[PDB]
Amino acid sequence: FEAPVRIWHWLTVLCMAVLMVTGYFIGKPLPSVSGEATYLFYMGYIRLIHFSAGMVFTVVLLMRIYWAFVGNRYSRSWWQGVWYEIRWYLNPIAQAAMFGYFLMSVFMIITGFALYSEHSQYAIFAPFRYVVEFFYWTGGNSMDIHSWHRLGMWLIGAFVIGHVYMALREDI
Amino acid sequence: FEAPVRIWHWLTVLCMAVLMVTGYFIGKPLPSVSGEATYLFYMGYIRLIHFSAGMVFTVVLLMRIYWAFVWWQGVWYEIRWYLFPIAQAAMFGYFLMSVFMIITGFALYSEHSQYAIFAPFRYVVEFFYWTGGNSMDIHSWHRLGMWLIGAFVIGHVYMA
Amino acid sequence: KPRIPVVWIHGLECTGCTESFIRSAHPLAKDVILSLISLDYDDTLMAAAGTQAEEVFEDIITQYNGKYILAVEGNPPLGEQGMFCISSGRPFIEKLKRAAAGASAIIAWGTCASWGCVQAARPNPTQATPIDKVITDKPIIKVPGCPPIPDVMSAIITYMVTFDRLPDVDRMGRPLMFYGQRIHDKCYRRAHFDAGEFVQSWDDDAARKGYCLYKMGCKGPTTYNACSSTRWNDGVSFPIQSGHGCLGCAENGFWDRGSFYSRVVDIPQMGTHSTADTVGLTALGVVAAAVGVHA
Amino acid sequence: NKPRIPVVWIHGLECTGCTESFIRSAHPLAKDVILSLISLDYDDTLMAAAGTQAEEVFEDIITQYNGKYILAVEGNPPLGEQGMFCISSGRPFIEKLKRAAAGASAIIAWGTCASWGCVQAARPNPTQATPIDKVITDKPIIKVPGCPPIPDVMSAIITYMVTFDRLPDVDRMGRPLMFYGQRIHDKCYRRAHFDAGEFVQSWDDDAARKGYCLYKMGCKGPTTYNACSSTRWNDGVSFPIQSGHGCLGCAENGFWDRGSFYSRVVDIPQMGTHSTADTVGLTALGVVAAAVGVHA
Numbered sequence A: 001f002e003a004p005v006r007i008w009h010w011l012t013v014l015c016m017a018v019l020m021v022t023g024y025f026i027g028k029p030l031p032s033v034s035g036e037a038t039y040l041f042y043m044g045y046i047r048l049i050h051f052s053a054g055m056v057f058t059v060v061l062l063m064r065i066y067w068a069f070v071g072n073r074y075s076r077s078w079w080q081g082v083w084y085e086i087r088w089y090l091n092p093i094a095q096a097a098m099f100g101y102f103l104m105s106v107f108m109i110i111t112g113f114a115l116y117s118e119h120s121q122y123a124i125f126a127p128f129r130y131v132v133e134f135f136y137w138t139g140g141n142s143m144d145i146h147s148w149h150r151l152g153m154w155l156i157g158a159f160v161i162g163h164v165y166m167a168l169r170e171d172i
Numbered sequence B: 001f002e003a004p005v006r007i008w009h010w011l012t013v014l015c016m017a018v019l020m021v022t023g024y025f026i027g028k029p030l031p032s033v034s035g036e037a038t039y040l041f042y043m044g045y046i047r048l049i050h051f052s053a054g055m056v057f058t059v060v061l062l063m064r065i066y067w068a069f070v071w072w073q074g075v076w077y078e079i080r081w082y083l084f085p086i087a088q089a090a091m092f093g094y095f096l097m098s099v100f101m102i103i104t105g106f107a108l109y110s111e112h113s114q115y116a117i118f119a120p121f122r123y124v125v126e127f128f129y130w131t132g133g134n135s136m137d138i139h140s141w142h143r144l145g146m147w148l149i150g151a152f153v154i155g156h157v158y159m160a
Numbered sequence C: 001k002p003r004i005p006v007v008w009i010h011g012l013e014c015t016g017c018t019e020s021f022i023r024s025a026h027p028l029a030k031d032v033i034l035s036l037i038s039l040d041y042d043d044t045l046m047a048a049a050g051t052q053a054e055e056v057f058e059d060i061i062t063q064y065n066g067k068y069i070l071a072v073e074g075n076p077p078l079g080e081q082g083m084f085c086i087s088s089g090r091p092f093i094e095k096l097k098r099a100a101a102g103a104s105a106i107i108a109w110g111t112c113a114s115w116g117c118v119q120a121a122r123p124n125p126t127q128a129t130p131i132d133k134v135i136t137d138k139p140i141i142k143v144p145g146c147p148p149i150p151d152v153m154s155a156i157i158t159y160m161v162t163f164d165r166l167p168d169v170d171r172m173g174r175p176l177m178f179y180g181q182r183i184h185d186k187c188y189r190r191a192h193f194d195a196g197e198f199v200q201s202w203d204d205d206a207a208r209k210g211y212c213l214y215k216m217g218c219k220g221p222t223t224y225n226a227c228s229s230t231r232w233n234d235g236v237s238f239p240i241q242s243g244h245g246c247l248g249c250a251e252n253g254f255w256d257r258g259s260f261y262s263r264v265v266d267i268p269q270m271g272t273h274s275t276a277d278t279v280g281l282t283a284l285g286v287v288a289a290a291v292g293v294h295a
Numbered sequence D: 001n002k003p004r005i006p007v008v009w010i011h012g013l014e015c016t017g018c019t020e021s022f023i024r025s026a027h028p029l030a031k032d033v034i035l036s037l038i039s040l041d042y043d044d045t046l047m048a049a050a051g052t053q054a055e056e057v058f059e060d061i062i063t064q065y066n067g068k069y070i071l072a073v074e075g076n077p078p079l080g081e082q083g084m085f086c087i088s089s090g091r092p093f094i095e096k097l098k099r100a101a102a103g104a105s106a107i108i109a110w111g112t113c114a115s116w117g118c119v120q121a122a123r124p125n126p127t128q129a130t131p132i133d134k135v136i137t138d139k140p141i142i143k144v145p146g147c148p149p150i151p152d153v154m155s156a157i158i159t160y161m162v163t164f165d166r167l168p169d170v171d172r173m174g175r176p177l178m179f180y181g182q183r184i185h186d187k188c189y190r191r192a193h194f195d196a197g198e199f200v201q202s203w204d205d206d207a208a209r210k211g212y213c214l215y216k217m218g219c220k221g222p223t224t225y226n227a228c229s230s231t232r233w234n235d236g237v238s239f240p241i242q243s244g245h246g247c248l249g250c251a252e253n254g255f256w257d258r259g260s261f262y263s264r265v266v267d268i269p270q271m272g273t274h275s276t277a278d279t280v281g282l283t284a285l286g287v288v289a290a291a292v293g294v295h296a
């Protein structure tokens, strides 16, 4: 068994809200506590909720993308790119927004997993270890992965401020 | 102030979500911090965000009715019948909790040596004392109210 | 068993610190003097004067060299070759250095010895200087305040006698026990501060209900001392409790920190009820005026 | 010159591991401790005098320096067989202990033996071996547990008491806060693996060769207070976990009787980040794979 099609959107939103709130505090952690670190795991739980929200998010996102593809794009190699451009200068800047949004999510996954699979996951995560070499090729290290990952989160939050105001503008 | 009726909904949900998340932590506070309390105000901010979200919320609820709606023994003839599909009684109950959450919530905020327009809320305190309790019970019933709302919110997320 | 020798000398001062010491409720100053220490020199209380007093001084610092505690009240002036404070025809700073040289530790009583206090305020006519700027080769325990709390003074004394050690100190040389926290962090009026409930003028309704004195210039938020917890004169009161804001008298150069009746700065301040009352009336007025009942 | 503080070091039922540990000290060397910081006036393991000469030393020290010497105790007294499970000068060791403690200013309880009872006190404790604090009740006793305690911890506690002229601050149990204030598990360099859910499952597996956590091999780090994970052993060369064996819990009271050393510790919160998130991912990947029809 499964459910209605809007479940697989409210999920992503739930995942998104969690990956943001948690990922935020992985980089700018909450105030410090004090006790006996045997019985305390606050930061560890934030990271855990993050990685596994990122698991769910990743699965849902990829199935949700697989269908839009199979179904022609949306509506029920740079040619199409250069042509998207001519008709693009005349709602055409709103599609490129929803597209950029799904492009970010995938970037947040490629980068997010490069970090997660690092300490020798040694299985199906083998490709993500090109992302690392790439950032090294850039003349950087895995710290840059963290930085670009944190940036992606802010960029997503930008669309969300737009996409939310744009939706609430459908309070006709 | 004569914008859509969409606006006065999403605000309420925003207020609700805040008054819940904040009110929760006024009662079961977050882990302790340590430093110098001159530069620290975490609980104080939580309490501040609460009281003032409770302000906005109250105003908007006092207005999501005067919008909704639009002698003292003449209205009686038409209200008495509701006193004697049943899918309104839930939406009605919800608005009733909100008002209970306001009466009790302000009862706490107001009786703090305020001399104002909050004078009626004092009765709420005397009522809880008449009950054979004190303002701690106001705190308890207030907290319970939050759970009950979350129950509806829990239920109203049926889909319809 | 013999009692630890204590030499108590006085520079430029008001004798407020000596006075404070004898206010001690527990232990009584009487019992400190008879049973806990050996107050071997103290101009205020000793019988001997002049050449007799000088003989006592010399005898103690010689006989107990390296073994006595030096207690310093007041401070030395550098102006006029030190002759702004004269002891036995010579600058007080000479007696200070001589006494310091044989001491095992120095207690700097009050703001005077610790920092400079009132005589060091603008324009410092006598070039009054705190002890630690003059003596650099000895452990110096600063016990600031004008004066310090009587029972704090005696508690520090009993600590050093009983535990046979100097109290742990901050980077300023203040005993952590009584100076580790700010007045403002143990003030019984913090509720009002945090609510935005302030005295605005003397003897208003707010003052008669014991509201916060922040707006009356209370320097509590920047002052380290024990007055809000230990309190004064056998726990009877402290400045804020009797309705005056903290002057900051335990802090370095507090006399020159602007008027005592001027608000303190760079202290975060955001009331709970003062903010929420404002958010309420902002919303209520936006509403009442739209309906038409601005009146 | 300057006199050194007199120290009387007596031995009950023990393995002499604590004395051995003491002389392992890297800084200060045991040589310099004996030469310059203290006066080791009685110590069966090292002293020249034996027999009646040893007895004379003992009597002379505790009498001359009565109320002024430190009593260091290694091992513990047996209560069984009227105390004759441990005989010193033809008499019960406990009599020596009591006589020594009566004149001491303070007592150091070296190791788990003196602190708690250690191996001889394990089930069924044939000799009724008893920790010092159960026998001596009117003197300050500083417990320095471990089997044995860390060499440099021992010397550091000694240097502290000499230099600062006082006893170290202690917990409710009498252990010095400085070295026993935290758990092995709270300063273990393998926490990263613990926290990720990366464990050694059997000896010399790939996990073991990468230095993964030893929680599932029975490590009692989570319940053991000691400095082994920070201070380390033998001039900071290693400690049990670093060389691949889990903590036995040797600084803790009755640790011998806390089940097998290769049995997991209980009531210790443990939820791995990568272990949980790997599960969450496959649970979701497998739910979808089932619905699409590419199961297995």
Ligand code: HEM
Pocket (backbone or CB within 6 Å): A016, A019, A020, A022, A023, A024, A026, A027, A028, A047, A050, A051, A052, A054, A055, A057, A058, A105, A108, A109, A111, A112, A113, A115, A116, A146, A147, A149, A150, A152, A153, A156
């Ligand atoms: C909307 C998607 C996501 C958002 C908004 C998000 C947000 C964040 C943020 C802000 C950080 C902190 C970066 C820093 O300051 O160092 C973070 C860390 C991290 N994220 Fe994400 N993330 C997302 C998706 C993912 C995914 C799919 C994974 C894959 C498992 C992932 C794995 C990680 C990892 C491994 C870290 C750092 C862990 C650590 O070393 O503590 N993220 N995330």
Ligand code: HEM
Pocket (backbone or CB within 6 Å): B016, B019, B020, B022, B023, B024, B026, B027, B028, B047, B050, B051, B054, B055, B057, B058, B098, B101, B102, B104, B105, B106, B108, B109, B139, B140, B142, B143, B145, B146, B149
């Ligand atoms: C849906 C609306 C509201 C929810 C869910 C809510 C939730 C809560 C909760 C759970 C508490 C914790 C009480 C406890 O455990 O002791 C609390 C405290 C409080 N609430 Fe509300 N509340 C709401 C509305 C209001 C309103 C309108 C006011 C009026 C200003 C108010 C004022 C307070 C006050 C004054 C306190 C406790 C004061 C203190 O910190 O000592 N609340 N709220």
Ligand code: SF4
Pocket (backbone or CB within 6 Å): C183, C184, C185, C187, C188, C189, C190, C191, C193, C211, C212, C213, C214, C218, C219, C220, C221, C240, C245, C246
């Ligand atoms: S500002 Fe002064 S009166 Fe107000 S809480 Fe702080 S110390 Fe007390």
Ligand code: SF4
Pocket (backbone or CB within 6 Å): D184, D185, D186, D188, D189, D190, D191, D192, D194, D212, D213, D214, D215, D219, D220, D221, D222, D241, D246, D247
């Ligand atoms: S269980 Fe043992 S090996 Fe693992 S982190 Fe804790 S102390 Fe270290």
Ligand code: F3S
Pocket (backbone or CB within 6 Å): C145, C146, C183, C223, C224, C225, C227, C238, C239, C240, C245, C246, C247, C248, C249, C250
């Ligand atoms: S004035 Fe001085 S007495 Fe205390 S209250 Fe302020 S430090």
Ligand code: F3S
Pocket (backbone or CB within 6 Å): D146, D147, D184, D224, D225, D226, D228, D239, D240, D241, D246, D247, D248, D249, D250, D251
């Ligand atoms: S066994 Fe003992 S040696 Fe330390 S590592 Fe555990 S306390």
